[PDB]
Design a protein around this ligand. Structure first.
Ligand SMILES: [Tb+3]
Ligand SMILES: [Tb+3]
Lengths: 30, 460
């Protein structure tokens, strides 16, 4: 099996009240 | 490569997607500086509701899409604070365990679990799921502070002197209007605003007011004042002004003129009709109005006055003295009729009607004397008046301006209730006068008060 790494962050969307960007990633490596 | 890839996030109840997938789901492939967006043919997005009623979001890669080695694939989409979070930060909901990092409302968890599923291998591949170990958090925006202002106005408008009693404070309440069925919360926030004599403007604010709702204000009914409530801000950023405007009052006054009896009482009717041409009913100070009619009884003990306090603005008034109460007076009015848009005084003047006395003196037998009277408008008097000769009240009648009387030596007749500002002349009839020299005191005269004329007959 290849190695996978996983990272999830949330970021306030600049200049907007109550909006946030979710970011869920995956990277595969040999 | 890995294949059959899919990325999964379960949103917690504190966030939610935007309308019409404004949420803009996309997956970006990042490799060597360059960023590329996977197409409809490479990834598909599904929203579903779990059994627990939470929203789950899945980016399903096209099944035979293989992840390029060393490339970072990143699902991205926007969420917004749900009502749960807006309420929580306002202080209106308690967190349970598992809601936020260390139960801090500023660190709500956005996810209730997130993972990636994938396969690898040719033929019968193998399947793994890895849970994301990051459990990210966010702070909702600050709740609203909602200002409230109270303005007191006198009868005639802004910053005019107020005369009515005011309470020492007013309790204002912010009403959070229910959206999802249900009843408005009429006790959502409360503040006590101070009220001081001659401080016309005073401000407070509701703290920690949750966004997402429409608000309104409740302010007490204050006797003597009308109330207007306005949102001087917007729906999403409310700010309220309450204006109490004093209601007007009608004072009825009686004035006595040329009247030495101060012990009489007078009845004065006031007719009150509304702008909407209607029956006005209710009690205003001491005076009750039944079907537009009110009655004021005045006397010295009540300082010749009555007050209808705090009538509706615009009320039409017509004051008139009761017929019975006018007997013996010339009655005139100031400000009899009008519309009540500020304080008003209506004055009834009862001027006592004048009398004429005529006296016969004999120097050196009945004597016939003719009285001629023209009224104020100069038209000859017609009517009967009470006349008195030593306590004997006989009616005396004037035809076309003339009456005539019979006097003995040293008799006085006194004629009451004659019209104000009329003119008399007296003349002895030439037959009575035969043998005597006649002269007169005050033969002609103006009836502006009680008058006296004297006829003296001297033998020879
Ligand atoms: Tb009555
Ligand atoms: Tb003359």
């Amino acid at each position: 099996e290849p190695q996978t790494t996983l990272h999830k962050t949330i970021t306030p969307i600049s200049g907007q009240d109550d909006k946030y960007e979710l970011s869920l990633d995956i990277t595969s490596k040999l | 490569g890995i294949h059959h890839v899919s990325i999964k996030d379960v949103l917690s109840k504190y966030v939610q997607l935007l309308p019409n997938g404004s949420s803009e789901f996309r997956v970006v492939k990042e490799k060597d500086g360059s960023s590329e967006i996977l197409t409809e043919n490479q990834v598909t997005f599904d929203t579903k509701t779990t059994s627990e009623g939470l929203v789950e979001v899945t980016a399903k890669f096209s099944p035979n899409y293989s992840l390029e080695d060393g490339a970072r694939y990143v699902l991205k989409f926007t969420v917004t604070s749900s009502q749960e979070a807006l309420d929580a930060i306002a202080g209106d909901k308690k967190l349970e365990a598992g809601d936020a990092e260390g139960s801090d409302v500023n660190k709500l968890y956005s996810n209730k679990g997130a993972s990636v599923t994938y396969s690898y291998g040719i033929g019968n591949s193998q399947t793994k799921t890895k849970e994301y170990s990051d459990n990210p958090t966010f702070k909702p925006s600050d709740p609203l502070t909602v200002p409230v202002e109270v303005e007191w106005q006198g009868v005639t408008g802004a910053r005019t002197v107020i005369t009515a009693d005011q309470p020492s404070n007013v309790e204002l309440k912010l009403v959070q209007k229910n959206k999802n069925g249900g009843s408005d919360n009429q006790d959502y926030r409360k503040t006590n605003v101070n009220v001081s004599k001659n401080v016309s403007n005073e401000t407070r604010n509701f703290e920690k007011v949750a966004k997402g709702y429409q608000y309104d204000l409740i302010a007490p009914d204050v006797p003597a004042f009308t109330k207007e409530i306005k949102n001087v801000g917007t729906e999403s950023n409310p700010s309220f002004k309450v204006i109490y405007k004093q209601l007007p009052s009608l004072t009825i006054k009686k004035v006595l003129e040329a009247e030495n009896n101060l012990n009489k009482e007078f009845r004065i009717k006031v007719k009150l009709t509304s702008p909407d041409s209607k029956p006005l009913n209710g009690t205003f100070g001491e005076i009750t109005v039944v079907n537009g009619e009110a009655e004021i009884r005045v006397e010295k003990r009540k300082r010749w006055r009555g007050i209808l306090s705090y009538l509706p603005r615009g009320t039409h008034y017509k004051v008139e003295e009761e017929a019975a109460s006018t007997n013996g007076y010339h009655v005139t009015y100031e400000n009899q009729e009008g519309d009540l848009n500020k304080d008003e005084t209506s004055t009834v003047t009862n001027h006592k009607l004048p009398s004429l006395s005529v006296t016969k003196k004999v120097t050196g037998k009945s004597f016939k004397i003719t009285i001629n009277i023209r009224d104020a408008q100069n038209s000859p008097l017609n009517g009967t008046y009470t006349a008195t000769v030593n306590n004997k009240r006989t009616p005396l009648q004037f035809t076309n301006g003339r009456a005539s009387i019979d006097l003995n030596k040293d008799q006085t007749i006194k004629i009451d209730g004659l019209p104000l500002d009329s003119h008399y002349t007296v003349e002895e009839e030439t037959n009575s006068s035969r043998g005597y020299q006649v002269s007169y005191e005050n033969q002609e005269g103006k009836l502006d008060g009680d008058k006296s004329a004297t006829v003296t007959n001297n033998k020879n």
